[PDB]
Design an enzyme around this catalytic site. Structure first.
Site, PDB file in Angstrom:
ATOM      1  N   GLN A  26       2.100   4.611  -3.148  1.00 32.50           N
ATOM      2  CA  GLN A  26       2.419   3.845  -4.348  1.00 32.50           C
ATOM      3  C   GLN A  26       3.876   3.398  -4.336  1.00 32.50           C
ATOM      4  O   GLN A  26       4.185   2.227  -4.589  1.00 32.50           O
ATOM      5  CB  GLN A  26       2.119   4.688  -5.588  1.00 32.50           C
TER       6      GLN A  26
ATOM      7  N   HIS B  43       5.035  -0.674  -3.682  1.00 30.78           N
ATOM      8  CA  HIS B  43       5.459  -1.390  -4.876  1.00 30.78           C
ATOM      9  C   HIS B  43       6.791  -2.110  -4.678  1.00 30.78           C
ATOM     10  O   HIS B  43       7.484  -2.401  -5.660  1.00 30.78           O
ATOM     11  CB  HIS B  43       5.523  -0.433  -6.067  1.00 30.78           C
TER      12      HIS B  43
ATOM     13  N   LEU C 178      -6.849  -5.021  -1.004  1.00 27.32           N
ATOM     14  CA  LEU C 178      -7.273  -3.992  -0.062  1.00 27.32           C
ATOM     15  C   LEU C 178      -6.666  -2.604  -0.221  1.00 27.32           C
ATOM     16  O   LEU C 178      -7.341  -1.601   0.041  1.00 27.32           O
ATOM     17  CB  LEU C 178      -7.043  -4.489   1.368  1.00 27.32           C
ATOM     18  N   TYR C 179      -5.390  -2.577  -0.615  1.00 24.87           N
ATOM     19  CA  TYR C 179      -4.563  -1.367  -0.713  1.00 24.87           C
ATOM     20  C   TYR C 179      -4.504  -0.676  -2.073  1.00 24.87           C
ATOM     21  O   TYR C 179      -3.540   0.027  -2.374  1.00 24.87           O
ATOM     22  CB  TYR C 179      -3.135  -1.789  -0.372  1.00 24.87           C
TER      23      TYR C 179
ATOM     24  N   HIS D 221      -6.354   3.948  -5.705  1.00 27.29           N
ATOM     25  CA  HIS D 221      -6.375   4.824  -6.882  1.00 27.29           C
ATOM     26  C   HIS D 221      -7.317   6.001  -6.714  1.00 27.29           C
ATOM     27  O   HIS D 221      -7.095   7.035  -7.394  1.00 27.29           O
ATOM     28  CB  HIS D 221      -6.777   3.979  -8.107  1.00 27.29           C
TER      29      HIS D 221
ATOM     30  N   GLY E 118      -6.878  -3.651   7.000  1.00 26.05           N
ATOM     31  CA  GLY E 118      -5.550  -3.254   6.581  1.00 26.05           C
ATOM     32  C   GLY E 118      -4.557  -3.173   7.721  1.00 26.05           C
ATOM     33  O   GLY E 118      -3.379  -3.499   7.545  1.00 26.05           O
TER      34      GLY E 118
ATOM     35  N   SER F 118      -0.670  -4.359   7.601  1.00 25.41           N
ATOM     36  CA  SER F 118       0.337  -3.306   7.617  1.00 25.41           C
ATOM     37  C   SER F 118       1.235  -3.424   8.843  1.00 25.41           C
ATOM     38  O   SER F 118       2.465  -3.357   8.734  1.00 25.41           O
ATOM     39  CB  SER F 118      -0.343  -1.938   7.571  1.00 25.41           C
TER      40      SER F 118
END
Ligand code: HEM
Ligand code: HEM
Ligand SMILES: C=CCc1cccc(-c2nc(-c3ccccc3Cl)c(-c3ccccc3Cl)[nH]2)c1OC(=O)COC
Ligand SMILES: C=CCc1cccc(-c2nc(-c3ccccc3Cl)c(-c3ccccc3Cl)[nH]2)c1OC(=O)COC
Ligand SMILES: *[C@@H]1O[C@H](CO)[C@@H](O[C@@H]2O[C@H](CO)[C@@H](O)[C@H](O)[C@H]2NC(C)=O)[C@H](O)[C@H]1NC(C)=O
Ligand SMILES: *[C@@H]1O[C@H](CO)[C@@H](O[C@@H]2O[C@H](CO)[C@@H](O)[C@H](O)[C@H]2NC(C)=O)[C@H](O)[C@H]1NC(C)=O
Ligand SMILES: *[C@@H]1O[C@H](CO)[C@@H](O[C@@H]2O[C@H](CO)[C@@H](O)[C@H](O)[C@H]2NC(C)=O)[C@H](O)[C@H]1NC(C)=O
Ligand SMILES: *[C@@H]1O[C@H](CO)[C@@H](O[C@@H]2O[C@H](CO)[C@@H](O)[C@H](O)[C@H]2NC(C)=O)[C@H](O)[C@H]1NC(C)=O
Ligand SMILES: *[C@@H]1O[C@H](CO)[C@@H](O[C@@H]2O[C@H](CO)[C@@H](O)[C@H](O)[C@H]2NC(C)=O)[C@H](O)[C@H]1NC(C)=O
Ligand SMILES: *[C@@H]1O[C@H](CO)[C@@H](O[C@@H]2O[C@H](CO)[C@@H](O)[C@H](O)[C@H]2NC(C)=O)[C@H](O)[C@H]1NC(C)=O
Lengths: 553, 553
Positions: free
Chosen positions: B172, B176, B353-354, B357, B495, B499
């Site tokens: 997270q 962000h 995609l990411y 949660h 991903g 990434s």
């Protein structure tokens, strides 16, 4: 104590890094050399530096012996030479860019903030004796005196390569899409965030400006009809900021992507030509793409114009500029194999280097008439009275001045050269010979070697005191020109890296973009591939005048 | 007539281009295939696709047979394979980027304007019967029902790879800095213009914000001392915009680069950790660079933290996520040979995609106590009461939930999943199997194949009507997971391209930047080269708690 990094100790792209109170160390990492000053070549680097020809020798090959070159042009040897030179002339330019005016080091702020002009060499450290280096006088020569003595035109010296005003206005027009210094933020910052061939001199430098200029029907730009010919819209129809003389009726102004193009007819001439081309491109697309919208039409037409802009610059603009017998060819696929970073950042050195005001003549001949500068500049009605055809013909037939050698800048526009010497000193550029070293040339050992003549060299030595303290801009214009050439050795070897990186660094040259769908079918892709100056001018006029970058024989 | 480009006719990265009223043609240029639909492989491409192993088979290789892999890690076979992985997982991502939300075509506005999220596949054309394609129902299933039925957690399913909350909060926190959707401009736009690992969650997303956060002494950031430990400054000391509950005392708030980090202690924990590291880096630099200034110190410390951020993500974050026995190693020099574009642009598909949660647990166990969500979230005093050490220890010891499989999102945070399904429909993403085809996988032939089980597959078939009409986000979370893995095949193959491109696309990995002078001597270069999660946490604390991305055995 003295700052060690002011001796410019490290050669061959070594990075001077201060340690402690008075020490330094250099990162020769990937510089091809080793040692405290990166002066000890590795095995291969020595192999390269010995088997090299001199830059004056290669100009000789490329400008002599045509029989060999006609054979080379019609065979694959051109493409290999294209790759050779193409893949070599761009390695001198950092990418991603390194420095800017505020930062003399690799930093994230210099990378992210696109308002800074990037930079090739770090600034002269502020804590050092002479304004240029450890060397030279303690005071720089008067800028206005340098110009009035060495850069001021006394008798019109024409370009021996036949360059005309049609070329020079294109250079001014083409290069005012990435050279837009913001007077508000000060020298060293740019308004043109495209940082390359974005045609921001046509579609403006922000969304707000292009929306006001776009007609929002079939992807076209707004326009007006004068004498039955297409012209760019008046500021009344397209309300965009423009720099115009006060009290000029806002129905004789014209709205274009660059705020300044109203001050010379030649620039507005080109803006007129590009607009007609854009709307003509938009017409072809809608014919083959009926289901498309305004944004879809517009953006694709933009890419087409961007593409055929680069095409014309490489194969006709630079072709004229170089005098090379080696046919220059625009083919992005030449760089598909190499590691090439498809992104550019305008360097403040390129800005200084590209000031070619010597191209401008004593007065402008338009057929029978001879307009002075006061009678030419700011003339809101000259373009409409004569028409695009007559002006393109008049400029192509009139010679343009030589750039190098010196003493060839007209007195009307000489106040630019002084402000450029002032600007170079405020940006704090490194001395000339240091830029020669960084661009793969040996430093000149005396002013007599620089200019190749005795009078003006001796005076320069009296003003500067030492060759190694020579400034950047004066050195370029005063360097001895190549034989029967428009400008000398240094302007070639220094501008060529930036120009190549800025034209082939455009994303459309990338593998992801350089395909026919990017231009909405083969029609757009062949418009880019087969573009010429003659086509751009004659496809958008009722008649075809004489258009070229060289006067007739 | 129906838009032909809604049948998704062209495979293997072919670009659908509409001609005429009802026709289409595809640019298979450089797609490795030929034909109207780019379905006819060339000689080499067929050679590749036949000698390919299946993605499930290669996961088997990389997750079994340790004896072979321990040998491969200690030999050059690692480095050769590293190149292989680097050159394979990054070619699927356009660079320069192609599309965005408003433009389903390569355009100059989509390249220049960094406020758009870029995009891999064009949007579903608006003039077509079903919201996804020509296929499926005329209405998509209710998002809230999909979540409450298939994505809602019923019993905590833990990650079988031992992933802890310490890992999840880093995911997270780390993500962000480039996933900052602007609520004002609407979904599909981003506030994080760095578009990569810029540590904009530490130094803010604009100059105004970082200046208010910077202490302007020795390059450090402002801070405050609570209980004798360093914490980020209160909003009173550093006046930057922050999202906090009303009436909370300002000398108990904290100012950080990301406006949202005050809402969870775990996010503020990492921001605290990074700030202490930054100021510690600033201390080391001033020790070796006495002559440097505030700006010089700050920017170099930033690059150091950026570097050791990427190091930790590659060799410890992804290492945990993959379960690979092949030790992953951060070395930009592996890509020096290949043509690699050192620039990234966050794709809206990567955003969808990411959204992991499911990693979040039912409740947060911190030693003896067990805080509920209402008791954990928004807790302005939790970090300072417990201290950095105790929280890092508590999170590393607590398991985190599995991502894939489905039915593993806690009910407190399920309203995010609903808004993500809504957002996917507003952004107009193509159906799931189309993203499989674009990412080198064969489409799933039925929902039973997707989930690997019969009950929940049959219901999905009733809601959607056809596998080819499945949405993007639901498909990722409901796909059958790899054996004893955190998430399934599709999340791996989709991903990894984004990434990898975002971490090694950072300019510091480029040849121009990846040198020791970029980090002000070897001290900075070795901080980047030898970074670990344990060092980042324990070098900035009085004690060393248990810190790792996996719970103890
Ligand atoms: C009558 C002809 C011309 C006039 C009146 C003119 C005028 C000007 C002026 C007033 C400036 C601003 C300089 C300052 O404020 O310090 C400028 C800058 C410049 N000129 Fe010219 N110029 C002419 C021809 C040319 C030509 C032929 C070139 C060819 C390359 C050229 C290239 C440039 C460039 C690149 C700049 C930099 C602008 C910037 O940095 O924003 N100019 N010119
Ligand atoms: C208690 C834990 C968490 C809370 C309270 C939380 C909260 C939120 C909220 C409220 C949003 C906005 C969504 C919307 O408005 O539609 C969001 C978005 C997001 N979440 Fe979380 N989340 C948590 C855990 C995680 C984790 C573990 C990840 C791991 C990657 C994650 C990844 C994301 C991403 C990438 C976004 C996109 C933000 C954007 O697009 O601007 N979240 N989260
Ligand atoms: C396929 C073509 C590669 C290619 C693409 C794009 C641009 C160039 C380019 N060349 C030159 C140049 C080179 C040698 C001699 C004289 C010149 Cl003026 C320049 C330039 C130099 C200095 C000031 C201004 C400029 Cl515009 N810019 C370029 O290089 C050439 O075409 C010619 O050299 C092989
Ligand atoms: C030098 C190393 C290159 C490199 C640098 C930086 C990041 C990566 C990376 N890998 C992966 C990955 C790849 C294969 C299998 C599983 C995973 Cl999780 C991911 C990723 C995938 C899906 C969701 C999230 C993420 Cl973060 N991101 C990366 O790629 C690898 O090291 C492994 O590739 C086989
Ligand atoms: C690298 O260059 C530096 C600066 O040009 C050289 O340092 C100078 O060396 C001379 C010779 O002794 C001294 O008189 C100067 O005082 C030195 N200047 C400084 C700033 O140190 C250095 O010698 C060169 N390196 C090598 C191996 O020759
Ligand atoms: C790019 O940098 C310039 C200068 O570094 C920024 O403009 C300055 O911003 C600071 C603080 O916001 C002000 O104090 C100055 O007055 C501004 N102008 C100048 C000439 O310095 C600019 O904001 C940066 N651009 C971006 C997108 O970050
Ligand atoms: C702008 O250019 C126009 C030409 O289009 C100039 O008008 C001409 O002026 C010359 C003498 O300078 C006369 O010989 C022509 O007969 C004029 N032609 C027209 C249509 O008027 C005009 O003087 C220029 N403007 C300025 C301020 O010099
Ligand atoms: C490319 O794909 C399109 C769409 O799948 C194919 O078009 C279909 O072709 C089949 C068989 O000819 C017809 O039954 C359908 O009616 C067609 N659908 C549409 C919308 O036209 C097309 O045949 C494919 N091209 C090739 C060479 O196979
Ligand atoms: C990037 O594009 C966005 C959207 O095209 C621009 O923001 C819009 O600008 C238009 C015209 O200025 C306004 O009408 C909209 O209200 C703006 N917001 C949105 C969400 O559309 C933005 O200006 C562009 N940014 C740059 C640097 O060009
Ligand atoms: C924020 O977390 C703190 C812990 O640091 C909570 O305070 C604790 O509350 C638990 C019961 O929930 C008590 O057993 C502890 O004795 C309390 N410790 C302290 C120092 O007060 C606090 O309740 C949490 N805030 C919110 C809104 O839940």
């Amino acid at each position: 104590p003295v700052n060690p990094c002011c001796y410019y100790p490290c050669q061959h792209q070594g990075i001077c890094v201060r340690f402690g109170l008075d020490r330094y160390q250099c990162d020769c990492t990937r510089t091809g050399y080793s040692g405290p000053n990166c002066t000890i070549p590795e095995i291969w680097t020595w192999l390269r530096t010995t088997l090299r020809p001199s830059p004056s020798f290669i100009h000789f090959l490329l400008t002599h012996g045509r029989w060999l070159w006609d054979f080379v042009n019609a065979t694959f040897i051109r493409d290999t030479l294209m790759r050779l030179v193409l893949t070599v002339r761009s390695n001198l330019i950092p990418s991603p860019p390194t420095y800017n005016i505020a930062h003399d080091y690799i930093s994230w702020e210099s990378f992210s903030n696109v308002s800074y002009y990037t930079r090739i060499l770090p600034s002269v450290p502020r804590d050092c004796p002479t304004p240029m280096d450890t060397k030279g006088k303690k005071q720089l020569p008067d800028a206005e005196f340098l110009s009035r003595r060495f850069l001021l035109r006394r008798k019109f010296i024409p370009d021996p390569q036949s360059t005309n005003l049609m070329f020079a206005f294109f250079a001014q027009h083409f290069t005012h899409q990435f050279f837009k210094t913001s007077g508000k933020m000060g020298p060293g910052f740019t308004k043109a965030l495209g940082h390359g061939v974005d045609l921001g001199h046509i579609y403006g430098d922000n969304l707000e400006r292009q929306y006001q200029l776009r007609l929002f029907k079939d992807g076209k730009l707004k326009y007006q009809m004068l004498n039955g010919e297409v012209y760019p819209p008046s500021v009344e129809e397209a309300p965009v900021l423009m720099h115009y003389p006060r009290g000029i009726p806002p129905q004789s102004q014209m709205a274009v992507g660059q705020e300044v193009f109203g001050l010379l007819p030649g620039l507005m001439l080109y803006a007129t030509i590009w607009l007609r081309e854009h709307n003509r491109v938009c017409d072809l697309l809608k014919a083959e793409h009926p289901t498309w919208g305004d944004e879809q039409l517009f953006q694709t037409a933009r890419l087409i114009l961007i593409g055929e802009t680069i095409k014309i610059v490489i194969e006709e603009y630079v072709q004229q500029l170089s005098g090379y017998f080696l046919q220059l060819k625009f083919d992005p696929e030449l760089l598909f194999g190499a590691q090439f970073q498809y992104r550019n950042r305008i360097a403040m050195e390129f800005n200084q280097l590209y000031h070619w005001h010597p191209l401008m003549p004593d007065s402008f001949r338009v057929g029978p008439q001879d307009y002075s500068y006061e009678q030419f500049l700011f003339n809101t009605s000259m373009l409409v009275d004569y028409g695009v055809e007559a002006l393109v013909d008049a400029f192509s037939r009139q010679p343009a001045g030589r750039i190098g050698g010196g003493r060839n800048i007209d007195h009307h526009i000489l106040h630019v050269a002084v402000d450029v010497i002032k600007e170079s000193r405020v940006l704090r550029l490194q001395p000339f010979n240091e830029y020669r070293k960084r661009f793969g040339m040996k430093p000149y050992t005396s002013f007599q070697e620089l200019t190749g003549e005795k009078e003006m060299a001796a005076e320069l030595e009296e003003l500067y005191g030492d060759i190694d303290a020579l400034e950047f801009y004066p050195g370029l214009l005063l360097e001895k020109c190549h034989p029967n050439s428009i400008f000398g050795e240094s302007m070639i070897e220094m501008g060529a890296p930036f120009s190549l990186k800025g034209l082939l660094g455009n994303p459309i040259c990338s593998p992801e973009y350089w395909k026919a769908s990017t231009f909405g079918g083969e029609v757009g892709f062949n418009l880019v591939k087969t573009a010429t100056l003659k086509k751009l001018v004659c496809l958008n006029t009722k008649t075809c005048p004489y258009v070229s970058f060289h006067v007739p024989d």
